[PDB]
Design a protein around this ligand. Structure first.
Ligand SMILES: NC(=O)c1ccc[n+]([C@@H]2O[C@H](COP(=O)([O-])OP(=O)(O)OC[C@H]3O[C@@H](n4cnc5c(N)ncnc54)[C@H](OP(=O)(O)O)[C@@H]3O)[C@@H](O)[C@H]2O)c1
Ligand SMILES: NC(=O)c1ccc[n+]([C@@H]2O[C@H](COP(=O)([O-])OP(=O)(O)OC[C@H]3O[C@@H](n4cnc5c(N)ncnc54)[C@H](OP(=O)(O)O)[C@@H]3O)[C@@H](O)[C@H]2O)c1
Ligand SMILES: Fc1ccccc1Oc1cccn2c(C3(c4ccc(Cl)cc4)CC3)nnc12
Ligand SMILES: Fc1ccccc1Oc1cccn2c(C3(c4ccc(Cl)cc4)CC3)nnc12
Lengths: 281, 266
C-alpha cells in the first residue's frame, strides 16, 4: 500500500495548527531520552507513529523506553547508548541513527550534564563540562545530522530554559551553556535563510518542569509551580513540527507575556540590510 | 557622573591590550594616573604600550605576555599582576580569539577555541582575581558585543561565546548581591568599532558606520568606574533605542521572590 500512497500532511493551516499525523512515519532522534522530558517526547512520538532513535548513557533504561515506544505504536524504535562528553560518539551516533531509520526528519537535542543549584566559586571543571555537554555536543550532532536534514527539509529542536534567556543565580555554568545555544543556533538560522538551507531551528525556552531530577535539584531552594513534563514534551514536538523559531513553556502567565523580546526581532531585521553575504552564497 | 580622577591610583588589569580597544583602554587609564598591567601574546607590542603608558602618566605600567588558550597562564597572570601592583581594583576582560566572518559548516575546532578563549578564560581570570577584588570592593568589566545580545549570521561561534558571557556573568552578579560580595560586573555591549582588525574582517561584508575606538575604550572604563551593570555603545540611534530588554529585568525581579539562598550564605 505505501508504494501506491503519496501526498502531504503540511497543507493550509499547518503553520498554524498541529495534528499528531504530522509526525506519522517521521524519522526522529531524541537525545537525553532515558528520563524526564526526553522520555516523554519519545512516548508522544511513538503514539504518533514516528520512527524513533533514543540516546542517553544508560542502556537498561533506554531498553525500557524503546520497549514502551513499540507498545505505544512507534513505526520503529531503537536506542544507542553513550556519553555526549565524547564528541566522536556524538558524531557516530547520528550516522548510525540515520542508517537505523533510513534518514532523518527531526533532531531533538535535549540532554544536559548533571547539575545542581550552587553558588559559583571555583568549579571551572563544571563550567567546561557544561559547555562541552550542553552546547558543543549539540553543534557536533547538528554538523553530523545536516546532510540528512537538508535532504528531508527537516528540523532541529534545541531544548533550552528561561535561564537561557534571563539570569538566575545558582546556575551560572548551566545558564552560560543555554545562552550559548541561543547565540549559536539563532546565528545559523539566519545563515540557513540566505543559503536556502530548508532546515528549521526551534529553540525551546522552558520554565520549571516536574521531572524527578529537577524537583530534587530545586528542593527547599526554589519555591515555584512546576509545569507537567507530559505537556512540556508535547509543546516541544508541536513547535518543531510547526517549524516555529521559538517555543515558550512555563506555569506562569507573566512569563508567557514577558519572555518575548520584540525589540531583538526588530533590531535583527534593521541590521539584515547592513551586510552583503553574496560571496558566501 | 564620571570623573577621570576615579581611576587615579587604581590597580587595573587590561587583557587583549596590545592593540584595538584594549590598547586604547590602557592609554586612557595611563592618562588618568592608574597602575596598569597589560596582557596579550605579543611581548614586543606590549613593550611599546607599556612605554607609551608611562609617557602618558601611568602611576606604574607592566606587561605579562601569554596566550589565553592556556588556563594555567590565565590563573598565574592574575597573581603576578596583583603582586606587581599590590592588589587589584578593576579587571578588564577584553581579549578574543582570531575570528573572521564566515558561514558555519564544519569548524568545531573554531567553536571550541572561541568558547575557551572568549568565555572560559574570562571565568578562570575572574576566579583568580576575586580574592583581591573582594578586598578592594573592585570591579569586573566584560567586553561583549551587540552579537552577544541579538543574532547575526557569519559569527555563530563568536556570538555563542558572547551570549555565554551574559548568562554566566549576569548569574554571578545576582549571587554576589545575596552573598554581600561588593564586586561590580559591567557587561559592555558594543556595536561596530573602527579597530584595524575588525575593519579588515568586515571589509566588503558589513557597511554600517564604525564608531571610534578611543571613545569606545573610554565608555567601557566609565561604565566600570560607575559600577553600571551594562554599557551600550554603538553609532546608530535605533540600536540605542532597541538593545535594552526592560522585560528581562522585570521578569528577573518577579522570580527573585520565588527562591531562598540562605543555606549557601550565613
Ligand atoms: N526540568 C526542568 O525543570 C527544566 C527547566 C528548563 C529546561 N529544561 C531542559 O530540559 C531538558 C531535559 O531536562 P530534564 O529535567 O528532563 O532532565 P533529566 O530528567 O535529568 O534527563 C536528562 C537526560 O540526559 C541524559 N544525560 C545526562 N548526562 C548525559 C551525558 N553525559 N551524555 C548523554 N546523555 C546524558 C540522562 O540520561 P543518562 O544519565 O542515563 O545519560 C537523561 O536521559 C534539558 O535540556 C534541561 O535543561 C528542564
Ligand atoms: N571591533 C569591533 O567592531 C567590536 C565590536 C563588538 C565587540 N568588540 C569586542 O571588543 C574587544 C576587542 O576587540 P578589538 O576590535 O579591539 O580587537 P583586536 O584589535 O583584534 O584586539 C584583540 C586583542 O586580543 C589579543 N588576543 C588574541 N588572541 C589572543 C590569545 N590567544 N590570548 C591572548 N590574547 C589574545 C590580541 O593580541 P595578540 O594577538 O598579540 O595576542 C589583541 O590585543 C573584543 O572582546 C571584541 O569582541 C569589538
Ligand atoms: F533538569 C535539571 C536536572 C538537574 C539540574 C537542573 C535541571 O534543570 C533545571 C532544574 C530546575 C530549574 N531549572 C530552570 C529554571 C530555574 C533556574 C534557576 C532557578 Cl534559581 C529557578 C528556576 C528556569 C526554570 N532551568 N533549568 C532548570
Ligand atoms: F574585533 C574583531 C576582530 C576580528 C573579528 C571580529 C571582531 O569583532 C567584531 C568585528 C566587527 C563587528 N563586530 C560585531 C558587530 C557585528 C557582527 C556581525 C555582523 Cl554581520 C555585523 C556587526 C555587532 C557589531 N560584534 N563583534 C564584532
Amino acid at each position: 500500500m505505501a508504494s501506491m500512497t503519496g501526498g502531504q500532511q503540511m497543507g493550509r493551516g499547518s503553520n498554524e495548527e498541529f495534528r499528531p499525523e504530522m509526525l506519522q512515519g517521521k524519522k526522529v532522534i531524541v537525545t537525553g531520552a532515558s528520563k524526564g522530558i526526553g522520555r516523554e517526547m519519545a512516548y508522544h512520538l511513538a503514539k504518533m507513529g514516528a520512527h524513533v532513535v533514543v540516546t542517553a548513557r544508560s542502556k537498561e533504561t533506554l531498553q525500557k523506553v524503546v520497549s514502551h515506544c513499540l507498545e505505544l505504536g512507534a513505526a520503529s524504535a531503537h536506542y544507542i547508548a553513550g556519553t555526549m562528553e565524547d564528541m566522536t560518539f556524538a558524531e557516530q551516533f547520528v550516522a548510525q541513527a540515520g542508517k537505523l531509520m533510513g534518514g532523518l526528519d527531526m533532531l531533538i537535542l535535549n540532554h544536559i550534564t548533571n547539575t545542581s543549584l550552587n553558588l559559583f566559586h571555583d568549579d571551572i571543571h563544571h563550567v567546561r563540562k557544561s559547555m562541552e555537554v550542553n552546547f558543543l555536543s549539540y553543534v557536533v550532532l547538528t554538523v553530523a545530522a545536516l546532510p540528512m536534514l537538508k535532504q528531508s527539509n527537516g528540523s532541529i529542536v534545541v531544548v533550552s530554559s528561561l535561564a537561557g534567556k534571563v539570569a538566575y543565580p545558582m546556575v551560572a555554568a548551566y545558564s552560560a551553556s543555554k545562552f550559548a545555544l541561543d547565540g549559536f543556533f539563532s546565528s545559523i538560522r539566519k545563515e540557513y535563510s540566505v543559503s536556502r538551507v530548508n532546515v528549521s531551528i526551534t529553540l525551546c525556552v522552558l520554565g520549571l518542569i516536574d521531572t524527578e531530577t529537577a524537583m530534587k535539584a530545586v528542593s527547599g531552594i526554589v519555591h515555584m509551580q512546576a509545569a507537567p513534563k507530559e505537556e512540556c514534551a508535547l509543546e516541544i514536538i508541536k513547535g518543531g513540527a510547526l517549524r516555529q523559531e521559538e517555543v515558550y513553556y512555563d506555569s506562569s502567565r507573566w512569563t508567557t507575556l514577558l519572555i518575548r523580546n520584540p525589540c531583538r526581532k526588530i533590531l535583527e531585521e534593521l541590521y539584515s540590510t547592513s551586510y552583503n553575504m553574496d560571496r558566501f552564497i
